Design a protein around this nucleic acid. Structure first.
Length: 246
RNA sequence: UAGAAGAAGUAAAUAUGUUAGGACCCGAAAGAUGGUGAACUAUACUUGAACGGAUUGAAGCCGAAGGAAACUUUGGUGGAAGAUUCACGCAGUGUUAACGUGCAAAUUACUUGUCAUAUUUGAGUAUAGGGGCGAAAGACUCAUCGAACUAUCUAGUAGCUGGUUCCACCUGAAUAUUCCCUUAGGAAGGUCAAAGUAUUAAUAGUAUUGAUUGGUAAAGAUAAUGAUUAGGUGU
RNA sequence: AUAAACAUACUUUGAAUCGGCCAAGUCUGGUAAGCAGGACUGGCGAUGCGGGAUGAACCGAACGUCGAGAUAAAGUGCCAAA
RNA sequence: AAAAUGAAGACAUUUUAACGAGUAAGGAAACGAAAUGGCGUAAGGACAACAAAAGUAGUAAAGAUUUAAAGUAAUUUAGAUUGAAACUGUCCUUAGUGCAGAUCUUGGUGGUAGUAGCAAAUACUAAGAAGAGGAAAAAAACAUCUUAGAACUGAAGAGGAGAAAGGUUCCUAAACAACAUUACUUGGAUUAGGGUGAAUCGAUCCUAAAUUACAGAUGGAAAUCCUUAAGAAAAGGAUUGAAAGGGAAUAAGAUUAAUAGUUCUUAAUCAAGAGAAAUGGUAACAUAUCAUGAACUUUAAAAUGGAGUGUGAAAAUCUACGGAAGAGUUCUCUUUUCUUCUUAACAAAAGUAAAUUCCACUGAAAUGAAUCAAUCAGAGAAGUGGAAUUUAUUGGCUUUGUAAGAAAUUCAAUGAAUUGUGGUAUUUUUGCAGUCUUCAUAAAAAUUAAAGGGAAUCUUUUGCUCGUACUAAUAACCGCAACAGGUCUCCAAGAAGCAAAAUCUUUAGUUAAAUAGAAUAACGCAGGUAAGGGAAGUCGGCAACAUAGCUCUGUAAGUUAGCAAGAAAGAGUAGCUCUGGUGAUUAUCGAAUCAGAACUUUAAAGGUUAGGGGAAUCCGACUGUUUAAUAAAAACAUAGCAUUCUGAUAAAUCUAAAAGGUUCAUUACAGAAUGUGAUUUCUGCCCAGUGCUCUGAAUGUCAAGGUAAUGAAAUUUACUUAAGCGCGGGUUAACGGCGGGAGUAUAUGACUCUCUUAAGGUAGCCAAAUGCCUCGUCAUCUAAUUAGUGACGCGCAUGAAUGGAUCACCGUGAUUCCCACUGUCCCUAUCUGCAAUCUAGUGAAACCACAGUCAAGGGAACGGGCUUGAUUGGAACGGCGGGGAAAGAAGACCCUGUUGAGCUUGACUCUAAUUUAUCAUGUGAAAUUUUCACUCAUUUCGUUAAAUGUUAAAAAAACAUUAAAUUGAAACAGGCGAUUGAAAGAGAUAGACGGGGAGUUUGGCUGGGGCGGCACAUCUGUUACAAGAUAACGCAGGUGUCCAAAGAUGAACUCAAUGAGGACAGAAACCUCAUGUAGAAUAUAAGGGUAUAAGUUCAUUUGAUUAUUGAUUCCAGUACAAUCAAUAACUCUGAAAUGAUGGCCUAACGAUCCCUAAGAUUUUUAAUUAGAAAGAAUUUAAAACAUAUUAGAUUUAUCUGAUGUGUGAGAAUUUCUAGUUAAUCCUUUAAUAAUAAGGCUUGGGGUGUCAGAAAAGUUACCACAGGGAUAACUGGCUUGUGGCAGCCAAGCGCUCAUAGCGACGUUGCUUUUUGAUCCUUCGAUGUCGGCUCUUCCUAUCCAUUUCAAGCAGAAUUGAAAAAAGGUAUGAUUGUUCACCAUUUAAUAGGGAACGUGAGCUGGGU
RNA sequence: GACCUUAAAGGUCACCA
């Protein structure tokens, strides 16, 4: 046989990210004393559209708590932010939309976004459009707090992990139905090469495990073990269930 | 059942036979190893270039009239759409036209379709052979692709096909038998040739006389086993 | 009884060969076959010559180069010798 | 062969006799009576004038051409001519030693053949010049240049220029041997010269996608990774990457045979250099340098998509008024028609614009302002007055300097003349303004300026390196070339029109671009027309005809309500003369557009351009893509729908490895893996099987390890270990699946019974692109329907995200029917151009054993050659497609190879990735090794390693720095800050999983292969032919066993059946007598054998045993197996002779290696006792240390010297008899021991393909070596079957066997069906039907002539002569065939390689 | 027709040309 399309994706030749017009890395600012024990105030200069992602980006400008100059940051917009707004980052920040607070200071039930899975790693969870994470409970014995991830899973993080209060802007993006093949083509302008997807049953036995015979069909069960080698791992992987959900 | 029984062997040059090597000469599709290719084509990115004329008329907006209201009727304006068409171009539906030792190792003529957003296109750049790339035809990867090109292993192997070079003279065949992964082929054996011997209980594809063997042709059918048409006599 | 001394008995080494085919006062399967397969012998293969007009197998007869005669199968109206 | 002779003769002796064919094959050399005889090629060693100049040769070698001679032949010899320097004969030796073939290799050359051709791109003609090169009885044509005529490209060009590529092709002169399919005086061709000028155009500079270094990391290696992260490297990050991106600065005229934003004249610009620090304006803001402005920081520019509308300006075109100069027309007119009337870079500022944004005064409602559209206003409209920016350089346009001195148009013979002003017109270019659109937001750096801050106190010089010629294509580039193919751009006139369309023309370019002339045949290619009919042609309206612009009227069903729709359908349209509407400015001026009216004619879109329309069915929703070179589609994509996994140190996944890489500059509205394919309606039941999974169970099965026991030890044994499987549950929008039979209300069967699945196919749909039967049944379409449509449904074998049903719009998709139109057709005629024909010049190729008249025969079963006939005159031109089983190609179909390759799978054997367990020693603790606590290796991260730890002390989009006065601005820790953490990663070993991947295999026989069978090891009878052998996928059957008795022996008895008797008792129970040759039994298939037995019964027993020989059956006289004959033991039975080494006989079975059992003690040795008999033993140089005894040292398992003796020494040993002890089948190679292992002999474990590999498929994507050893087609033999014909006569025919038929039987012919065979063809004979056309047969359908009848006439029926002439048109189907509707005198049947493909078609296959 | 099964009846095969 040949090497299937999923195998050719891992080499990254034509499947490299189309990130040329992107604004940059969107994250919190690097942790320091002034964020651990004080608050630094930033100014939302503008709100910009980052190619390839559905949420807007804010060009915040903190000043320089230790030197002279400007610290041009690049945050992910929370819904409701506006140009010229002031936002405060630090442990003593007020509980307002757009402010950055350690996850331990947020009252149980607070909605946050752009949460750090580890202290000081500048944002991991709840970064897509309209997404958010909820603080479940605190644990002052070992300085851990429980949050509910947007997928529904519960995760325990350190109580000093930072997060931004609010909802990532641009929600309800995927509810608008794409209508045309051309529109879907334009969606991957600043993404990887994946769109026009040929069914495995339409390929040939050399190309794909599904490449069939005189009738377009699979032939063998499409639920496979997690341990299948790359090359035959095509279809549902480690499927605990199948069929329409009730 | 090997041996001994007053030793025969050895050396070298040829000829013939067996055997290994390119192996009488030429012939595979294949396999492995190392390199060269994206000047053709495939996809993707960077930076450039290229929409002229018509058709239809969506939101949005304005007037008039009707209405308690909700709003409706009517006339305009507007210029959307992977909307309809023509042109520069492009493709290749049909003639299964031309040509078919061509203009051309895929072109020409008319007809047909298409002719800016999933568009067309230049340069740069990236992806390499059990790999790439593929809106998927096993398609494309320099006229080479159901695994490119190039060189080495390599004069690859062939029970299969083709060829195999002077004269006279003498002798002159085979298709049984056994075994084989055997059936287009081999070894044992038969037929044949050439060398070399032995005075030789070592002649016969013949007939006769004598003693035998066998169960074929024929013959038989209340002679045994069967098959089958009738007629008398007795109970 | 007849024949047999270039009789007889061989020994060694080795070549090619084991695709066969035909005839019949023969046989088996088949309706049958210029079909398929066998017993015995003679042939073609390996083979020309004379005759059957022509023909791998039929009939006579097998071959160094020639001359003369008697012949064989078979023929004798012309082609064609009688 | 035998005799005779035999040192040398010679002819390989003399004589006599017999013999002589031959494919494959053999006979090497030498051998005197020669164990075959010789010829030739080349080289090596000798010999070649015997008397001291010793083979031939310039008095002509080798070679070549021939003429003759010798030899059976291979070959040799000699002469003649040519040739001019080496060569030959004999003997041995040696070998790169003899050619007709290999689709042989290389080179050369023929026929074809003066043949096919030298035919796209409209086109040339006259006069003259130059030249050898238009002559001549028309030799009808003539290359280059100039002039004139006539033309084409038609300004998206056949024009003027660039990028790439080419590389001197550029310009000129001389010259034409070759080349540009004739020629050339021409040339992009030959020869020789000349030619490319930059401070301003580019490269150079910057960075994009990307690329590459030192050090570092990885690797066995080559090398790979990393690109600023790891670095004592680089205020911050290295190299390269654009002649289309960014970018300091030049223009006009003139000049050269050719270079020019490059030279010259004139006129400019740019960069680098040289000679307590300003005013004005209310404000927006403004001032020939002015008017200081460091570090540091920020902002902006360079630098940002597309569409569409409006509009400013310039240019081009057109036009209004006024002219000046020149040109054209002019016997008909034309105050006429045409040309010229221009201006740069850089700067200036008389005059004067459009649009946008801001500033000041004021404060809008009765709301206003404005655009084509919009849009805006108390965070302030409108108004008035101002400021700024943009508009191809200063400042947009006119104007000005440059500058008229240039340039253009004229005139004179260098010198003179002129060079106004406009437009509410079109196009192009370039800006501007707002509007729309994106799940698309549409680059960076070099480089420049400004600001915040307040540190410090005009002239002139120079401008380097490299490119610069030319083409840029119907001749300079890539395709072998001057190739009708391909290749990126800039500039762009008139007519007409909606139009950059078609058509014609101006400026420019060219008239040649693979040759022409004559004639005007066939057959063609390209373009046409056609009476009457109108698809009747055909697989099919293929091809062609037909519709075609604009205006007005009108427009259906269906529908996703958007469409259908340009639906369909109808009318108008010309020319000329007029009339009216639509404005600007304030009476004058201007625009093409619309409407209307008289009149005339050839009655009007049509020169060119320019939709045929309608009714339905299927598939796909749509726009899109696709097999470059036979498939453009129903296939792929698509939006929509659905499922699975993943919290990122993850999922997927590349890599040998890696602080390695991709999605990821990412974070579940995300990433990755799949199925279905818009919308509507709906997705039924099944978890048994195979997958997937579980948050699940332990003590079923499971490895290396770990622990323990025995033993001298290896070894062995036991216990305990993870995943995996098993056990239990879940899951089908996971792979997939979704039944039978019988009664029952003139038929059907609601109903009932019964069998048993995991579930029994549900809603739907249907002879469907899915239905064999089948051309299903009923309607409809037609005259006629294997076609279409609508219905029916026990549906071979429909059916629900393998998606079911439904269709609106859409489609170079498949199918049917109507209208219109027509040469598709009846049925062909005719016209034009280019060829073909002939000629001058020029000039190939495929192919070719030799060749070329027929019939029949035979033959390899279809001859051009052979045999017998028919017949023949030599050379051929134009056509032609019958033949040459014509050419092209080692058949691609089929088969065979112990030949492959792609693909698939629990085929066999493995393997990367995944996974589980153990080992690989961080500290300090607890529980029964586990659980904890820590960090210290380790992992994953973050930053400018920027306040770690412990003490101490949401009103405002603005600024924040270089400090004033060691502090100000606190100290210390041996932790840059977090995170994980002794667990996880990488290594080793072990178990599981693993078509993701690698290697390989897939028996044989065979009336072709496959399916079927086993004729493959094997027995009986028969074919089988009276010895032995012996065929078929011949016939009838049989084996892979069974038996402690069914082996051995002894004894007794006689069986099957029948008759006659005997209570129940009978046809069959048990008893008796008689007859009883086996008709019973003997394990089994069949055939043999058997009567005081080989059968039945009784009794004893284990010979169904050990060892050794010799034979017989298959046989190769191998093995296995079997069948016998003896011998030596120990036994069984019998009184005994005998019998017994399995079964009454013919089948009942098995190598090498490997595993596993049994046996090798009968005998031979050593030592020591007692007895006896023979026995001299070889001869000088010495160290191992067993040690004692001393001289030193030492404490530890204590060693280190030297003195010393024996050892170890040499001037007994064997045999034998009787004991005793011990050992005893051989070996593990220095000697022994107990374990272990290996030998030797004999059995068992098995190969059934049975003389014995370890082995699944599919190729319609296929490949190679071959095959007529072998199938699919013709032909040939046969004729079962198909067709036709006879003989007899039981009967039918109202009576009557034979008018006409003829049963039960029986004899033939034919090759028009299909069989049966495999003879020819596998380095190829083109395989169905139809169309066209010719011929042949008669077994005759019609016409002609006759006979018969159950023939009155008519219509008919049977038969004879006769094959000269006729034998049709359509619907459906690819059909042959068939079935319908017609018509006719009849609408007969057949052959010719199932006639006919260099004759067509391509419907089917 | 061939193979299989039941108490005649069914079931699978019938292929490359």
């Amino acid at each position: 046989g040949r090497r299937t399309l999923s195998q050719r994706k891992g080499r990254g030749s034509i499947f490299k990210s189309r990130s040329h017009h992107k604004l940059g890395v969107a994250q919190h600012r690097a942790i320091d004393f002034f964020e651990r024990h004080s608050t630094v105030r930033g100014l939302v200069k503008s709100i910009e559209h980052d190619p390839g992602r559905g949420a807007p980006l804010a060009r915040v400008v903190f000043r320089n708590p230790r030197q002279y100059g400007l610290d041009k940051e690049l945050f992910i917009c929370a819904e409701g932010l506006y140009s010229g707004q002031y936002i405060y980052c630090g442990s003593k920040a007020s509980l307002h939309i757009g402010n950055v607070l350690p996850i331990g200071q947020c009252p149980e039930g607070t909605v946050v976004c752009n949460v750090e899975s580890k202290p000081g790693d500048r944002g991991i969870i709840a970064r897509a459009s309209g997404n958010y994470a909820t603080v479940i409970s605190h644990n002052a014995d070992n300085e851990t707090t429980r949050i509910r991830l947007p997928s529904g899973a519960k995760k325990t993080l350190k109580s000093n992990c930072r997060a931004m209060v609010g909802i990532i802007a641009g929600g309800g993006r995927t509810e608008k139905p794409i209508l045309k093949a051309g529109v879907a083509y334009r969606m991957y302008k600043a993404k990887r090469t994946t769109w026009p997807r040929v069914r495995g049953v339409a390929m040939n036995p050399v190309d794909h495990p599904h490449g069939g015979g005189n009738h377009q069909h699979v032939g063998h069960p499409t639920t496979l073990k997690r341990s299948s080698p790359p090359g035959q791992k095509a279809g549902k992987v480690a499927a605990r269930r199948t069929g329409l959900i009730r």
